Design a protein around this ligand. Structure first.
Ligand SMILES: *[C@H]1O[C@H](CO)[C@@H](O)[C@H](O)[C@@H]1O
Length: 240
């Protein structure tokens, strides 16, 4: 019952900064298909408060933040999916640099109070322009060496090519290619039966170690997922 999380081979706890190009080089016609692309995209992702959080930033000449991680859209699937359909279009140049600078801020400095250290991910979307900007911009460099991940989709390995018509076809292998880079959290055993009274304590045990994912850049840290003590602890306590 998953696609990019849980048992498949990668963690549910994950933050995403969607960086969408809104320059004049895409046109407004194709931009509508982009919103349709993101709509069905968020439908797939297990977006929850303790699962996947999302953040969307559009950019053209300047940077236009839609909502960060502390936004109610970040934790609700139906809200975010509805919100992406209502995003405006602003012509102009192509400022990917400050766009990645914006995503870096939301992910590493703008996380929800519980999970700052969870695997960060940038899912960018560009056209025929700025093919190298997702490798050139210093922000892209700084994200990867913090345990962050950058994904690129050019229209017209983490680099994916697609056409305007077959946009939705790119979703399936993208989440597949991402799950390789992602780590896997520790496999915890099922909970034990509740103790009598006084208070009531239930316990579980860690089965296998957290499998760290594949590092993004040469000689730079990789996300390593969370142990069972980081998933809620081996023991939970209730009163009676
Ligand atoms: C123990 O805790 C709950 C049971 O209510 C579930 O999240 C799961 O079954 C786990 O093993």
């Amino acid at each position: 019952d998953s696609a990019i999380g849980a048992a498949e081979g990668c963690t549910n706890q994950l933050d995403i900064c969607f960086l969408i190009d809104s320059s004049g080089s895409i046109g407004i016609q194709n931009f509508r298909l982009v919103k349709q692309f993101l709509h069905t995209f968020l439908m797939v992702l297990p977006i929850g408060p303790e699962e996947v959080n999302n953040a969307v930033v559009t950019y053209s000449t300047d940077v236009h933040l839609q909502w960060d991680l502390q936004s109610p859209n970040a934790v609700d699937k139906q809200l975010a999916a509805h919100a992406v359909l209502e995003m405006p279009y602003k012509k102009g140049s192509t400022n990917t640099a400050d766009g990645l600078k914006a995503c870096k801020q939301i992910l590493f400095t703008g996380s929800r109070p519980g999970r700052e250290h969870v695997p960060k991910l940038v899912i960018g979307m560009t056209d025929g322009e700025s093919d190298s900007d997702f490798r050139t911009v210093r922000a892209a460099k700084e994200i990867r060496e913090l345990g962050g991940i950058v994904t690129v989709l050019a229209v017209g390995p983490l680099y994916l090519r697609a056409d305007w018509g077959q946009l939705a076809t790119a979703i399936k292998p993208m989440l597949k290619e991402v799950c390789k880079t992602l780590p896997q959290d520790a496999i915890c055993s099922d909970w034990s039966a509740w103790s009598p009274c006084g208070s009531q304590i239930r316990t579980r045990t860690e089965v296998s170690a957290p499998q760290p994912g594949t590092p993004t850049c040469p000689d730079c840290p990789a996300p390593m997922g969370r142990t069972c003590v980081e998933q809620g602890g081996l023991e939970e306590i209730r009163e009676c």
